[PDB]
């Protein structure tokens, strides 16, 4: 006794699914409307569809929804795995598939979930094995033919739905394709995963829904389980009264976020580590935070926001730090790729890499992309007359197509960062791609840089950061980081707070890696960009 | 294009057979400057593959086929670097040039872009259209986007305070302009157009 009741109540249901509202309701109605009343389909005089191809990233919850529908309806969930049914014996995997379909058609109208169909559907042309084509033909025979199916629906699951046969993706077999790929759904999953345990009273789920921006849904349960394990692990070192006042806290969730990092997603500061550049911080904060926080006002105005920002100037200025600081406050991801870390010697590999990065960008909205070394990627294609020139032309055309081509530009924030804007072609600087031409160029700013660098550091009341910043006279953020690193090395040498003599002995060994003629060139380029903006005034209508 | 040997041509054959099967069909080839590059001679493996792909395109658009309805639209920005075997009637017969918009065209572009945007009643766009030159549709889009951003700024700082984007918003947005296409790049297009003429 009791066991048969518990194993009935532990079953999953529609109350245990979160975020996939519209597709869950669509599958629910298209399954249950045949099962609740067939008189409606008798009156309308048509047969319902009998095939669902589910696609998306692995770990989303597709088989959980299929099991929930199979639990909420009087069906029989039979699970068929992809690599399990395939064997090396000739005529054995087809026999296993026929036996599974006969078992599904024998007892009751049931629901078949064949998982990982991409392993047993090699498109009949790219494969070399005969057994794969044989089981593909067995699947098309069991799904369509003379008296093929008698009141039974099959469900599939895959990650890449393009490597399936066009005969498999036909009507009657997989006639409905469901894309199970946000913050409110993640909060619903957190609420349904933290339902059977009293965690605390002062735990706020807003930070847990905003910081885990790249979690697919199957990692949230592992996160909560790891937190519940770590709480009992850290609360058992010393130990009726122990069971009272149990549960996880915010530091437990912070430790779960820190010890465990993988988000099962292929994705590569807080407004304080950057010093100076107040108007640049304000402009980036505006042009990033408004299309994320107020979509309804932008749909009321009926206009699409701007996307691309391009920075240029001397190296060691803080462009990557600015990109991280504008990415860190939103709930977006961050894909920071480098210039020469995508080019290959093969034919088509660089453009394939560009397509994969942009597909991974548009597969998770919103997402800011950080393209570095635009002078190394674009090269202002023009004419080179060579193999490297043709590869550069093809890379530039693929990049131009991915920025503004046959796309939807849902939520992609491309941010470029180069140190030579003269070697960029005038097609990426067109508005709509990289329209924001923000130039990133003092002692009052170096004070803020030293205050942002010395955030969590034991400081001396006798040191003067104004006296440190006054003797710079044209240093960079990299030079200030080198000075701070030398002071920290001298501090750890004196240990094995920061004192003033460490800075006094480290200020002499400065670098000043930037010369003067490159500064003259950058000022001449900025003056040319200022003089190109001509005959423009307040412009009274 | 593909990494391997003889696969970009299988790709071209597959897409064109798909087009011929599901006729009528419109195949939009974007940036022909990549695929349909002047064959000539490059003396390299990339040269060999980029010539094989062009030759496949020639035999697929005008070869031994049934002439079923398939309309190929090409869109390029360097038409001087395309094989003349493509630029010929039978494959791509008519070369339509789209210069920068004139005053009426740009005014119509602004009106089309603001089709679904609340605007002031007395704000005519003729002044902003006459007080510009050398611009493109993308540039007009940028000006409109900046005006919308200033209007949203005003709305947020007020917070239906400002239902309509106003003349001062548009003027402040137009205070800075893009000027995407420079004369250095435009004179080459003018030379190409007059050479074609």
């Amino acid at each position: 006794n009791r066991e048969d009741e518990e194993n009935n109540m532990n079953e999953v249901g529609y109350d245990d699914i979160g975020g996939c509202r519209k597709q869950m309701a669509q599958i629910r109605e298209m399954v249950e409307l045949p099962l609740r009343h067939p008189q409606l389909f008798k009156a309308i005089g048509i047969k319902p569809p009998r095939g669902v191809l589910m696609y998306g990233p692995p770990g989303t919850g597709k088989t959980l929804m299929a099991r929930a529908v199979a639990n909420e309806t009087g069906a029989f969930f039979f699970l068929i795995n992809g690599p399990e049914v395939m064997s090396k014996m000739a005529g054995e995997s087809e026999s296993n598939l026929r036996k599974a379909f006969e078992e599904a058609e024998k007892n009751a109208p049931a629901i078949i979930f064949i998982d990982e169909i991409d392993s047993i559907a090699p498109k009949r042309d790219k494969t070399n094995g005969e057994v794969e084509r044989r089981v593909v033909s067995q699947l098309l025979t069991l799904m369509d033919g003379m008296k093929a199916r008698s009141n039974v629906v099959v469900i599939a699951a895959t990650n890449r739905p393009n490597s399936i046969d066009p005969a498999l993706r036909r009507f009657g077999r997989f006639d409905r394709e469901v894309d199970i790929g946000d913050a409110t759904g993640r909060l619903e999953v957190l609420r349904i995963h933290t339902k059977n345990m009293k965690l605390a009273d002062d735990v706020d789920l807003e930070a847990l829904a905003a910081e885990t921006h790249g979690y697919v849904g199957a990692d949230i349960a592992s996160l909560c389980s790891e937190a519940a394990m770590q709480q009992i692990r850290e609360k058992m070192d010393l130990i009726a009264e122990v069971l009272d006042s149990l549960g996880v806290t915010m530091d437990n969730f912070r430790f779960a976020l820190g010890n465990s990092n993988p988000s099962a997603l292929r994705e590569t500061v807080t407004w304080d580590d950057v010093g100076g550049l107040d108007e640049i911080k304000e402009e980036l904060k505006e042009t990033v935070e408004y299309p994320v926080l107020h979509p309804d006002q932008y749909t009321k105005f009926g206009l699409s926001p701007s996307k691309g920002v391009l920075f240029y100037g001397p190296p060691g200025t803080g462009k990557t730090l600015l990109a991280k600081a504008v990415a860190t406050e939103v709930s977006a991801n961050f894909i920071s790729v480098k210039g020469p870390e995508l080019l290959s010697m093969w034919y088509g590999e660089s453009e394939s890499n560009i397509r994969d990065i942009f597909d991974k960008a548009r597969a998770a909205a919103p997402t800011v992309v950080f393209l570095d070394e635009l002078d190394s990627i674009a090269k202002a294609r023009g004419g080179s007359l060579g193999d490297a020139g043709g590869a550069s032309d093809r890379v530039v055309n693929q990049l131009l197509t991915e920025m503004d081509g046959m796309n939807a530009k849902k939520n992609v924030f491309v941010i470029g960062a180069t140190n030579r804007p003269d070697q960029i072609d005038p097609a990426i600087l067109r508005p709509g791609r990289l329209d924001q031409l923000i130039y990133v160029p003092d002692e009052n700013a170096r004070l803020s840089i030293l205050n942002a660098q010395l955030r969590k550091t034991p400081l001396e009341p006798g040191l003067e950061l104004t006296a440190i910043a006054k003797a710079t006279q044209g240093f960079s953020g990299a030079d200030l980081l080198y000075i701070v690193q030398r002071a920290a090395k001298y501090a750890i040498k004196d240990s094995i707070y920061i004192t003033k003599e460490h800075f006094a002995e480290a200020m002499k060994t400065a670098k000043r890696s930037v010369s003067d003629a490159e500064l003259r060139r950058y000022e001449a380029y900025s003056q040319q960009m200022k003089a190109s903006r001509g005959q423009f005034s307040n412009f009274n209508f | 294009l593909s990494m391997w040997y003889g696969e970009s041509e299988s790709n071209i054959r597959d897409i064109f057979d798909k087009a011929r099967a599901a006729a009528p069909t419109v195949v939009f080839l974007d940036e022909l400057d990549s695929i349909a590059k002047a064959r000539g001679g490059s003396l390299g493996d990339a040269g060999g593959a980029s010539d094989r792909v062009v030759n496949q395109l020639l035999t697929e658009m005008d070869g031994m086929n049934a002439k079923k309805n398939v309309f190929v639209i090409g869109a390029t920005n360097r038409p001087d670097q395309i094989d003349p075997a493509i630029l010929r009637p039978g494959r791509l017969d008519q070369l339509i040039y789209v210069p920068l918009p004139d005053e009426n065209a740009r005014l119509s572009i602004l009106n089309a872009q603001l089709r679904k945007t609340p605007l002031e009643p007395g704000l005519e766009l003729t002044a902003i259209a006459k007080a510009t030159q050398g611009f493109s549709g993308a540039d007009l889009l940028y000006i409109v986007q900046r005006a919308a951003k200033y209007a949203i700024k005003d709305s947020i700082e007020a917070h239906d305070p400002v239902p309509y984007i106003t003349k001062e918003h548009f003027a402040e947005a137009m205070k800075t302009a893009k000027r995407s296409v420079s004369d250095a790049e435009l004179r080459r297009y003018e030379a190409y157009s007059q050479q074609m003429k």
Partner: peptide
């Protein structure tokens, strides 16, 4: 009385492909 039986199932081979470089 008992009896024996013969069985010959399948085999698996390995192919070789050609690649194209861009210098």
């Amino acid at each position: 009385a008992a009896a024996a039986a013969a069985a010959a199932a399948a085999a698996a081979a390995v192919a070789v492909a050609v690649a194209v470089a861009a210098a």
